[model samples]
Target: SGAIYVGNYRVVNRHLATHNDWANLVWEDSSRDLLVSSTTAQGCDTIARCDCQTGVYYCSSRRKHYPVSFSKPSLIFVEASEYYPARYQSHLMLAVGHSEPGDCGGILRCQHGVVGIVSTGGNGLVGFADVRDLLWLDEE
Candidate 1:
């Protein structure tokens, strides 16, 4: 039989936006969130708090910082429908076969950086928002 993993996660505020692969976030502490949680198989203990703009990453062949990038929009595949939040269209979606419902809101990290979030999952297919187009409305 197959099994799955359970992890802790955080929820986003009303001000949510989705591009082709990522989502931008802001917190009460006023720290700019960045691509973090630098691994694939993460759990409660492995998960770290978003440390503002001082993003964390490796530093060499043994510990080298991986550069962040969100070039492509269609990296992963999933079959689903999109719904609009009229009250606050803070959109979200992504996929990682085997993902489930409770998995939403979790940051989807890559070797390079966080590519998306665990927005939707079911029937072995996980879909997240393309965090690339995290357009901040407060851009001044």
Candidate 2:
């Protein structure tokens, strides 16, 4: 079966201006009230956090620079599947680097399965099912 197209949910926030992709939009909801974070293609690894209910989005850039990077930001997606455990069944995907004239890398995950390394300049689509799987060694 093809991917299911979720409804066109409106993501309104002051921070959305930093987002990159104009065609495909990806976002994640946080525990904080009226908050969501997404990526943008405006160069410089950037992510925009927006509040749909409040009509505001917050913009932030990756502090660490990626070597041999692309102008566009990566795309991140989250979904739940039955192939893995409850915690592992949910998958998150991120398209790293630019699609042209640059390195491309990707990561796929379901529960404890981590398929790729988090290196810079490796442009490819990646996914993570469980959020806690990635250990935050450094705060960025």
Candidate 3:
């Protein structure tokens, strides 16, 4: 790792969650509203698409043709995912011990500061802008 330029996406098997392991921030797609999937357990079965009027996150996995660009003020951390999205596109979770707003089954929603894990779970902590101000400095 150690060569990072996050956002307006240019990701490649980049699994970033350290400083105390705050993962689980799975934000799914639009595809025309334009979005698809990637950024979670980056073995990427990916056929991703997100062009929410030029907020790109495209992939064609196992063939390696990813055209990446996604930034609404780039913030990312979906620590090591397993249960992939197949429907009901909305998920938010962030748990290190407590504050589990439905703990692994959707809807710990936050706005303006943008933290959500609407329909599933994995680990904890999402991204930024106000990702609880870096998840409260990894919860002190």
Candidate 4:
């Protein structure tokens, strides 16, 4: 028998006019197929109403790892103002973890910026940025 995975998912609507709503950013990726089969139904839905600024959604899994494998994804909406500076090379600033004020990395690229993991001593910032302009100020 084919079991229907009963569950719900949450959707967020964005208000483009007010940049303040930018905090409601939701990034998603899934690899559920790796652990589940077609015979069973696996799905999830958000139980509560979430705001655009900061909200968390939960999902259930019908696979071997029940309860323990449940996933909770966070949605963060960073206003355009906050993301704008980071988008430009001249206005960008990077400070490694808990390092000093001026002890930061340099811009890696100017235009068509780089995208990848920006790491310092193993820690990384996974996203888009000027990675090609890595200036290790901490290095002598």
Indicate which candidate wins on TM-score: 1
Kindly give the stretch of ten consecutive residues in candidate 2 with the minimal lDDT sum. 51-60
Best by lDDT: 1
Q: What are the per-model C-alpha RMSD values against the true structure?
A: 13.6, 17.8, 15.7, 20.8
Per-residue lDDT of model 2, residues 14-128, tens digit only: 1221243224344433311011223232222212222111111111123232322112222332232222122321222233433221111222222222222221222243221
Superposition error at 53 for model 2 (Å): 37
What local lDDT score does residue 74 receive in model 2, on the 0 to 100 scale? 29
The CA lDDT at 7 in model 4 is: 30
Candidate 3 residue spans exceeding 4 A from truth: 1-74, 84-102, 109-140
- lDDT, candidate 1, 14-132, per-residue tens: 12323411333232110111222112443332222221222222221122233232223443333333432222112333232444444444455553444444444466444444443
All candidates: TM-score:
0.34, 0.17, 0.19, 0.14
> lDDT for every model?
0.32, 0.23, 0.22, 0.19
Clashing residue pairs in all predictions, respectively, total: 23, 27, 19, 16
Q: Looking at model 1, which ten-residue stretch has the lowest summed lDDT? A: 28-37
lDDT of 3 by residue, 24-89 (tens): 232313210111122323231212122121111111112222222222433233333343324322
Candidate 2 has a TM-score of 0.17
